[PDB]
């Protein structure tokens, strides 16, 4: 079996996953058919022409974050004739390594100490397509200004992407190759853009000039503005040859005025980022908006005027000219109320599907305005002040998060409205009156402490996914949420406020009324007592998440009231009982779990005992997760209790003995995780079979193995059953005797 | 050194703390001078007349929770002639042990399976003062009705306390000894109290008859009411001879009427518990209130009428007759508003110091009414609906928590007002207008998201302790809270809402304005970015809790802005930097910590390195807590860097080597905790000294010790330095070789 890497086929490639393994040097045991070697996050200090000798099939090597700087000799990689991608990020490299192979098409030197880009380093790398040199000198790091040798990129006639962001450049480098498609120059101290800087870049599709003359008020990083907080100075004809431009990033360039003619020669500009500028005036007038008919994304976030909290947002009539617009981001403009008249220019846009108004301190909204859009799909109003109606990831965006605004699982149902992190503490009878038909509603974190009673959502009765997490909801009415006839997903996580009070009444009977409820999450509610109806019932429910409650109290051996709590969930296939402080489950309570279960999690409890015999009543159980408990032993007759179990997770328990014949006849078991237990040895008889079984993954890392001659049988078993993958062999370590301690058992 | 117990002198006694040590049997190595032996929470299965042989000095033995049932032979303890207290709780005992010693004065058999109280078991125990037999048959436990042999307690002529609560008794046992002072009969299924039941109990000071004919609606336990939910039936003259009664517990007896004459012969009744009854009518009229002039505590909590949410609380004019009343508990009465007129009967009471109105769903209050009380000290209004002004511990109380209503540290300053767990989401200019002078104010968990600006608390400017935890406060004004000139303790824990948003402004400059601020808690605020002023400053602050923030971000090596964040806290002696995800502290940032520090906690971070040399700039540092980090090694020159360090906590780190001379010259160090590290051995040279040093406590449990001949020097060091206590010797275990694994190193 391969050691120390884990090999995986990925289409026309074989990846040797060898990261985060405490490797002091590159292993001389890499498979000859391995094409991509990931050695990131190890303690490798030196690379020589011997490091990867003979490994001619390598097309990619990742040495990022080594040593967790990296010493690379001249020509160390030269003999690898098929090497195309070399990642050397976060290696404290003082220079571009010398004698790199001419076959390289991608070279990443992000987050190093390289302040000189020389012809000796890269002129010979004529096949380079992508070159990343970002984040070598920035913020208050002690570093030198970047010297770019004149014409250093000129011979790179196939270069398509060049990134020099987060380096002190002062000027755009001259003599850039005309093959460039993407040029990143963010946070480079380039205060002036001349008409010659991008002269020959006729195939450019992306230009990033963000963070040059930055807007520094309240910056979450060391920020140095241009003299007098002045804007980036762009010559009138700087972009005249950028006819193929699709992406233009001018975020944090302290822009107050936008010359509409800068877009005259950009007939296909698609995404324009103007976040962190001073464009409230331009948003209200904006002649440049008339020069962007094929723009799809416009980001004008955080353009607020410090000290100004106006009553309304002032959107120019010229926003109506953005006929291709699909997403408009207007976070941090800052205004008190959003009225129908204020968004009239956006209502004629036929494909505007996302509107992001997060972080504007909005207090009130005429919700009826959202009925007058053609294809509005995401209405993102999270993090405002709406009340009841009367360190830096170099591979991500620096000015905004890139995750979906609304969870794709919620947004997939239809029109999505996100009102999370607001103050809609009480939903009165007219709160949702003039809203369009909403399918996905997020009301998380609104300080809502009301008793929902079946009428609050009557104006939007087709909500399919409702997120009410992180409120103080008082479940005190059996008719709660029943007006949502089509509800499929309901998230009530983190509403423990009233559940934790014994003396108040608690009612969860409403769950039974839903004909189409599939997923219900009651996590972290501290549920320990219910009033009158002790059971959850539903003919439709498929998944119930009950983690972070108190089944230790509900199933106390002196109380029989909750022994059938989940029995009525007749269609349930997934059940999560993690984090319920369970020391034991009464046998009658385990037997009352739905017989339809396919996946049962009881991880992260304090289980001292598990009655394996009871698996005879779960003929469809495929996954049993008992990780993070205090189980002391395993049954020797699992094969007699189940013919369906496929995955059994027992990591982080106190099992010190694997019984003889444990797996001999459990044919269905594919994955067994016994990692982080107290196994000192494994006898041959515990893993051997006399029949063909489906075991293909066995985890044993973190056990305190005794590496005397008594471990030989387990080692011989590993050699004789190569189809059973054992991951993390570097962590399947000897705890004793002293001479073997720390060494991997495979040696 | 004593093994396996830890011995401690406690006045005229020596306690062998031997609990929770995995002991399979009572050790035969108990010290001959030990007078109290605590063997609770072990795996002891058998007790014989050999178990404690020779240990004649034992006056107390605690065997509670063994085995974690206990098999006790007839006469096993008989030879212990000085044995006075024997605790045998939670031992699954089927009977009272036979042949117990006549010297017993206290016997506890709580939480066992004893359903027969016989003369064979206790008639000979004539010196018994306290006998606890509670919790043997209750709720849905499979158990038999308790048979009390006629006259079983009659020979116990010195019995002062008898507890039989949580057993099925049906009737009060006849022939109780007249020496009784406290009789507990709670939850005993005693539906009728006859005039003969307490006839001779003329010295009784406490009578507990709670839970007999219980009020079962919404009970957090299996509850069986009397037929037709009827009340406990008490004969008119049942309490005629209880002239010394001080405590009477009638909670959950389904009382609707209280006969005032039941108190005619109780001239000194002090505490009366009537919680969980149906006494709204009696609270409004209450003739019984005229018969309690020396009552100090009255608890009428949870007497609400199911389905009734009245506008006002109806307190009888007869509450004015409770002239000795000190505390009135009226939780769970349930009413919408508290007006001045409603509490007029309480205002004439001269020593009413506590009023508890928790859990009443109160929406509004005329706060001016609290100005008209003589000595109101605690105004407890937690867990209501106040909006902006327009399993069972057998040793605790079953019907209410016994902890202080308000933290003693807050209440000690003066008049305390607790408004936590309400909905005062915004403090307007008239919110505290008519409140009396408040010294301790709790506004925790009110969903408050306002920008405090220095005027909100102007009507109560002498608040000394202010708790604003668990809100959504927006620290966006430098003048916040500055009107509280005398503020000494400020708790801002759990107000992370706005701190976590980079794009909004954050202002903590207000801290500097307080002349008398001593303690500030900014825990769990996710603080990672501040606006304009990056430093905390204060001439008075003594303690700062900064746990649960992001010093990993504030002290990122590429940012110099926060390197002096705590330097201006010139009087600081205690600093908590735990839970800040720190991997390293920049040397300049550690050197900028206040030189006045005496106690520094940096526990539960991920520190890989600690620069020990920098302790030279902290001449008053006495405690350094680095527990729960990933430190790989220790300095060999700690003695050169400090002459003040007294306690050094390094548990839960990755130290595998103790350097030679580590402690030889650090004379001041008293306590060193190296538990749960990766020490395989300890060389003699690492702990030896050539000078007299103050080391007196060394923790080493949880290390993977190699028990070959190389551990002999450490064992000889332990034998030669007995003044250095090493706790938990049962957990100072051999990890290797196989033959020694699991055994204690002391053998
Ligand atoms: C409704 O709105 C809330 C609040 O805006 C959304 O909550 C956010 O959900 C994301 C994704 O689950 C959370 O991110 C996670 O953060 C943890 C660390 O805290 C990390 O371990 C995960 O990998 C992940 O990145 C985010 O923290 C959370 N925000 C808050 C304030 O809770 C929620 O997703 C929205 N619901 C729907 C249906 O869109
Ligand atoms: C409350 O419980 C629900 C149900 O478990 C949680 O939603 C579920 O979250 C999981 C984990 O993020 C989602 O699974 C993941 O889906 C993605 C996309 O398909 C996939 O790439 C991952 O491998 C994984 O399978 C799951 O789809 C999602 N279910 C639904 C219906 O949304 C929810 O996050 C819980 N809420 C809180 C606050 O924890
Ligand atoms: C202001 O009011 C709040 C809310 O009523 C008080 O908070 C409560 O404080 C107690 C004592 O610290 C907390 O108890 C602790 O619980 C944890 C487990 O959660 C346990 O580990 C501790 O040993 C302790 O028992 C209690 O949970 C907490 N309640 C809430 C809802 O946070 C606060 O003490 C009041 N402040 C003053 C100055 O009195
Ligand atoms: C925010 O930080 C403050 C300051 O550390 C916390 O208050 C302090 O809590 C500790 C631990 O409970 C108190 O110490 C204990 O005091 C008792 C009584 O004297 C003593 O028996 C214990 O041995 C221990 O010393 C300390 O007095 C208290 N300080 C003050 C001024 O109240 C507070 O609990 C923290 N808040 C949260 C929400 O964690
Ligand atoms: C994304 C914007 C972040 C900041 C910017 C402040 O310049 N705003 C805010 N930052 C925080 N942390 N909170 C709030 C806030 C809370 C409620 C309502 C509006 C709010 N704003 C908006 C704002 C307010 C003001 C009046 N505030 C005074 C009154 C109290 O003392 C100060 C002036 C300009 C404003 O935006 C430009 C902010
Ligand atoms: C300590 C009392 C615990 C329970 C007892 C209920 O019998 N009350 C409450 N339990 C919870 N979990 N919440 C609330 C609550 C929230 C806001 C205001 C009052 C509230 N009460 C008070 C109450 C209300 C009603 C009207 N509720 C209907 C309207 C909505 O559907 C039901 C009748 C009798 C009442 O007390 C007797 C309760
Ligand atoms: C490269 O892989 C091929 C096919 O997987 C194999 O035949 C060849 O020997 C390998 N070459 C080297 C140098 O390992
Ligand atoms: C590596 O380079 C050295 C000279 O520095 C040479 O002697 C050796 O043969 C080279 N090894 C390989 C595998 O090319
Ligand atoms: C890298 O290692 C070589 C020896 O293998 C040494 O000569 C050279 O100076 C090292 N480079 C650095 C930066 O230490
Ligand atoms: C894009 O333009 C440059 C010259 O202007 C050229 O080198 C490159 O190959 C062009 N793209 C294609 C696909 O030829
Ligand atoms: C609705 O949108 C149209 C453009 O499609 C606009 O002309 C009209 O005035 C809008 N009406 C309202 C009521 O907002
Ligand atoms: C639930 O609330 C509705 C609407 O307020 C009310 O009509 C109904 O009586 C409530 N149900 C119960 C059982 O209180
Ligand atoms: C059970 O769940 C499936 C989806 O997994 C659903 O199609 C089916 O209708 C459910 N059964 C009932 C009775 O609702
Ligand atoms: C498992 O459950 C059965 C049936 O409830 C019970 O008879 C048996 O004793 C349990 N097994 C163990 C090991 O306790
Ligand atoms: C009891 O303790 C005393 C004084 O501590 C000691 O002299 C005596 O020997 C002890 N007796 C026994 C039986 O251990
Ligand atoms: C304990 O009792 C046995 C009889 O069961 C007796 O032989 C033995 O001597 C007794 N031991 C002590 C120490 O009293
Ligand atoms: C206790 O142990 C003795 C033997 O030492 C045995 O005779 C007796 O039956 C045991 N009691 C129980 C309840 O098992
Ligand atoms: C209390 O009363 C009983 C008899 O009525 C008696 O046994 C007991 O000793 C009395 N208290 C005192 C201090 O004598
Ligand atoms: C204040 O209390 C007194 C009794 O001390 C009472 O007579 C008087 O009416 C009360 N006044 C007000 C305004 O509540
Ligand atoms: C702080 O708030 C007060 C009261 O609203 C206001 O007068 C003052 O200008 C604010 N300070 C700042 C710096 O905004
Ligand atoms: C420093 O703290 C002490 C209390 O520990 C206090 O008495 C003293 O006044 C404080 N110093 C200043 C300058 O406020
Ligand atoms: C400790 O700090 C000093 C002064 O800042 C620095 O010179 C030294 O290198 C640091 N020690 C270590 C081991 O890095
Ligand atoms: Ni085999
Ligand atoms: Ni010595």
3D structure, described in words:
The structure is a homodimer of 747-residue chains. The first copy, chain A, contains ten helices and 40 strands. With 747 residues, chain A is mostly beta strands. Chain A has one domain. Chain A has a 28-stranded mixed beta sheet. A two-stranded parallel sheet of chain A has the order 4-6. In chain A, strands 9-11 form a two-stranded parallel ribbon. In chain A, strand 1 and strand 2 form a beta hairpin. The longest helix of chain A has 9 residues. The first copy, chain A, is flat, with a radius of gyration of 31 Å. One 2-acetamido-2-deoxy-beta-D-glucopyranose (NAG) binds next to loops of chain A.
Q: Helical stretch count of chain A?
A: 10
> Oligomeric form of this entry?
homodimer
The amount of helix of chain A comes to: under 10%
Cofactors and ligands present?
Answer: a molecule of 3 linked components (NAG-NAG-BMA), ligand A1BLT, 2-acetamido-2-deoxy-beta-D-glucopyranose, nickel (II) ion
How far from one another are the termini of chain A? 12 Å
Domain tally of chain A: 1
Structural class of chain A: mainly beta
């Amino acid at each position: 079996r391969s050691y120390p890497c884990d090999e995986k086929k990925q289409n026309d490639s074989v990846i040797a996953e060898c990261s985060n393994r405490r490797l002091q040097e590159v292993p001389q045991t890499v498979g000859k058919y391995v094409t991509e070697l990931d050695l990131s996050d190890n303690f490798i200090t030196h690379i020589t022409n011997e490091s990867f000798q003979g490994l001619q099939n390598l097309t990619k090597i990742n040495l990022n974050h080594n040593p967790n700087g990296l010493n690379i000799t001249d020509g160390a990689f030269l003999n690898l004739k098929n090497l195309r991608e070399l990642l050397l990020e976060d290696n404290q490299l003082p220079q571009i390594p010398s004698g790199l192979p001419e076959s390289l098409t991608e070279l990443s030197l992000i987050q190093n100490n390289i302040y000189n880009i020389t012809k000796e380093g890269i002129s010979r790398l004529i096949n380079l397509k992508n070159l990343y040199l970002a984040w070598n000198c920035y913020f208050n790091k002690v570093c030198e200004k970047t010297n770019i040798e004149d014409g250093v990129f000129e011979t790179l006639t196939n270069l398509e992407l060049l990134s020099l962001s987060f380096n002190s450049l002062s000027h755009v480098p001259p003599k850039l190759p005309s093959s460039l498609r993407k040029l990143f120059l963010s946070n480079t101290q380039i205060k002036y853009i001349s008409e010659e800087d991008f002269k020959g870049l006729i195939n450019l599709t992306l230009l990033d000039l963000s963070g040059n003359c930055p807007r520094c008020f309240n910056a979450p990083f060391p920020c140095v503005p241009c003299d007098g907080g002045a804007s980036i100075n762009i010559d009138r004809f700087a972009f005249q040859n950028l006819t193929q431009l699709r992406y233009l990033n001018l975020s944090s360039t302290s822009l107050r005025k936008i010359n509409a003619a800068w877009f005259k020669n950009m007939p296909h500009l698609k995404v324009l980022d103007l976040e962190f500028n001073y464009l409230v005036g331009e948003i209200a007038s904006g002649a440049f908006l008339t020069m962007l008919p094929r723009l799809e994304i416009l980001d004008l976030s955080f353009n607020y005027i410090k000290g100004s909290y106006p009553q309304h947002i002032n959107i120019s009539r010229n926003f109506s000219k953005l006929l291709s617009l699909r997403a408009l981001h207007l976070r941090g403009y800052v205004f008190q109320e959003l009225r129908e008249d204020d968004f009239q220019p956006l209502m004629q846009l036929p494909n505007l599907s996302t509107i992001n108004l997060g972080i504007n301190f909005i207090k009130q909204i005429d919700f009826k305005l959202f009925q007058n859009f053609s294809n509005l799909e995401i209405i993102y109003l999270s993090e405002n002040r709406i009340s009841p109606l009367v360190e830096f990831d170099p591979h991500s965006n620096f000015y905004h998060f890139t995750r979906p605004l609304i969870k794709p699982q919620c947004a997939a149902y239809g029109k999505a409205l996100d009102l999370s992190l607001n103050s809609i503490f009480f939903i009165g009878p007219n709160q949702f009156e003039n809203l369009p038909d909403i399918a996905c509603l997020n009301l998380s974190a609104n300080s809502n402490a009301q008793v929902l009673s079946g009428t609050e959502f009557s104006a939007i009765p087709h909500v399919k996914y409702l997120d009410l997490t992180n409120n103080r909801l008082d479940f005190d009415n059996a008719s709660a949420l029943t007006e949502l006839s089509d509800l499929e997903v309901l998230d009530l996580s983190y509403n423990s406020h009233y559940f934790r009070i014994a003396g108040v009444t608690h009612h969860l009977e409403f769950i039974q009324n839903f004909t189409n409820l599939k997923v219900l999450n009651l996590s972290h509610n501290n549920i320990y007592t219910l009033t009158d109806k002790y059971n959850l019932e539903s003919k439709s429910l498929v998944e119930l998440v009950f983690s972070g409650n108190r089944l230790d109290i509900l199933w106390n051996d002196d109380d029989n009231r909750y022994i059938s709590i989940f029995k009525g969930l007749k269609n349930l296939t997934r059940l999560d009982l993690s984090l319920n402080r369970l020391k034991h489950i009464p046998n009658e309570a385990f037997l009352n779990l739905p017989a339809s279960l396919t996946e049962l999690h009881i991880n992260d409890n304090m289980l001292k005992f598990f009655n394996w015999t009871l698996l005879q009543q779960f003929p469809r159980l495929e996954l049993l997760d008992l990780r993070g408990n205090k189980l002391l032993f395993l049954t020797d007759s699992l094969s007699d209790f189940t013919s369906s179990l496929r995955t059994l997770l027992l990591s982080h328990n106190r099992i010190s003995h694997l019984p003889s014949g444990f797996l001999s006849e459990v044919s269905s078991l594919k994955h067994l995780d016994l990692s982080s237990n107290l196994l000192k040895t494994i006898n041959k008889s515990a893993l051997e079979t006399k029949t063909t079984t489906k075991l293909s993954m066995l985890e044993l890392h973190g056990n305190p193995f005794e590496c005397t001659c008594d471990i030989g049988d387990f080692r011989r078993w590993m050699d004789e059953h190569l189809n059973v993958k054992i991951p993390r062999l570097v962590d399947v370590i000897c705890a004793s005797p002293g001479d073997q301690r720390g060494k991997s058992i495979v040696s």
